[PDB]
Amino acid sequence: GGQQMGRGSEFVKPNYALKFTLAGHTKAVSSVKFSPNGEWLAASSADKLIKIWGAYDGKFEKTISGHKLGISDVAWSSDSNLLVSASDDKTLKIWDVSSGKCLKTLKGHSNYVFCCNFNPQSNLIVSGSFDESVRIWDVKTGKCLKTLPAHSDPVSAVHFNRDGSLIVSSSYDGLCRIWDTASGQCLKTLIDDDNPPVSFVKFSPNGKYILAATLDNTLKLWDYSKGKCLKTYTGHKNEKYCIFANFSVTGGKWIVSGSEDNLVYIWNLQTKEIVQKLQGHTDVVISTACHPTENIIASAALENDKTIKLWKSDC
Numbered sequence: 430g431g432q433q434m435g436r437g438s439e440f441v442k443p444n445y446a447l448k449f450t451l452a453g454h455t456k457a458v459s460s461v462k463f464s465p466n467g468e469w470l471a472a473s474s475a476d477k478l479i480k481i482w483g484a485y486d487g488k489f490e491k492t493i494s495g496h497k498l499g500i501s502d503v504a505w506s507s508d509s510n511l512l513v514s515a516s517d518d519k520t521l522k523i524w525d526v527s528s529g530k531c532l533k534t535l536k537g538h539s540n541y542v543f544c545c546n547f548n549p550q551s552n553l554i555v556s557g558s559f560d561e562s563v564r565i566w567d568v569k570t571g572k573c574l575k576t577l578p579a580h581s582d583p584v585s586a587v588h589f590n591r592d593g594s595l596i597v598s599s600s601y602d603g604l605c606r607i608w609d610t611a612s613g614q615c616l617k618t619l620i621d622d623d624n625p626p627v628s629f630v631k632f633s634p635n636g637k638y639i640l641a642a643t644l645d646n647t648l649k650l651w652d653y654s655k656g657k658c659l660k661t662y663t664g665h666k667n668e669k670y671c672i673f674a675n676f677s678v679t680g681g682k683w684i685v686s687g688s689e690d691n692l693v694y695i696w697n698l699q700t701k702e703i704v705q706k707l708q709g710h711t712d713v714v715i716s717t718a719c720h721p722t723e724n725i726i727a728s729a730a731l732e733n734d735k736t737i738k739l740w741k742s743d744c
Contacts, residue, residue: 430704432681432697434744441681443695443705443742445726449487450709451737453480458729460502460673461718461737464509469526470718470727472737473500473514479524484720484727487739493529496522501543506551511568513554515542521556523568535566537573543671544586548593548610555596557584563598563608575613579606585671586629591636595653599630605641607653619651621658628671634678642667642674648686650698662686664703665694670731673716680724680744687714693728693740710734 431440456475463470463484470484477499481490498517505512511532512524521535521542540559547554547568554566563579566572580600588597589610596608603624607617625645632639638659639651646667650660665688674686682698693707693714707726712733719726724742 430697430700430702432699432704434681438744441744443681443683443724443744445693445695445705445707445724445740445742447707447709447738448741449739451480451482451487451489451739452735453489453492454478454735454737456499456735457732458716458735458737459500460716461727461729462503462505463718463720463725463727464505465507465721466509467720467722468509470737470739471503471505471512472727472729473503475499475732477516479503479512479514481526482737484725484739485723491529493524495531496520501541502545504546506547506568507549508551511547511551513545513547515545515556517541521545521554521566523554533568533571535571535573537564537576538562543583546588548589549591550593553589553593553610555587555589557587557598557600559583561600563587563596565596565610565613577608577613577615579608579615580604582626585627586631588631590632591634595632595636597630597632597639599627599641601626601628603627605630605639605651617653617656619656621649628667629674631674633676640674640676640684642672642686644668648674648684650684660698660701662696662701665692666690670713670715672714673718675717675719677719677724677726679720679722680742685717685719685726687717687728689713691730691734693717693726707740709738710736
């Protein structure tokens with residue numbers, strides 16, 4: 430599995446090793462995200478709470494409460510000062526991180542809100558729901574700016590590209606779709622050979638590619654411009670849950686994802702070989718996040734486990 434970087438780094442391999450286990454959620458953990466400034470790690474949970482820990486030392490920071498039901502997803506503003514969370518109570522909430530207070534409650538979805546993201550500028554929030562729609566929301570006012578009749582099944586993931594001009598969404602309907610932020614037009618529907626449910630999607634950091642997980646145990650790298658699947662990553666287990674995947678970019682070039690056999694998988698992005706599997710969790714690893722500047726992975730597991738783990742590597 431060796432990966433080529435610069436001279437004398439011809440065969441780089443990651444060596445992620447467990448550094449902290451973060452206990453305190455009382456149900457399944459649903460989503461972990463590092464603050465873009467790298468200082469914090471937030472985890473949402475089916476226990477209706479968001480918790481924040483220090484990303485480097487694993488020290489408990491705060492619990493943020495007020496949703497009436499479980500939280501499926503959480504996302505940071507670009508300045509690390511706000512969180513948005515997506516809840517079974519049909520709302521999103523915007524939080525002031527420093528105070529822990531709810532700033533806005535975004536109402537409009539008619540079923541569970543399952544996924545959320547700020548755009549890079551962080552004036553907007555995008556959401557996907559069991560109501561089969563993608564919504565775009567004004568952060569400052571609270572208003573739903575657009576409701577996109579996006580899919581014919583629950584929306585599994587939503588994500589803006591590097592400049593915010595595009596949203597990618599995914600759905601158990603088998604489709605990945607790309608939407609013009611400004612017009613709300615569907616620009617593209619991407620789908621392969623076969624039509625398994627699409628359980629996760631996100632743009633690459635440069636916005637040129639799309640990583641999509643499908644519930645047939647497959648992650649795929651797509652070129653957005655050409656509509657072509659370039660790479661496939663397999664060997665992990667994903668047939669049931671909406672599991673987050675990631676580009677890891679701070680050391681070697683890896684794809685990182687959770688798996689239903691309780692492991693974190695890490696693949697060489699270029700050759701598609703598995704380079705590492707991280708043991709430790711005792712239930713499905715539903716979420717992984719890659720730290721924005723250090724080789725740090727956060728992982729989180731479902732009901733039988735209830736922990737987040739922080740893992741560190743030399744590359």
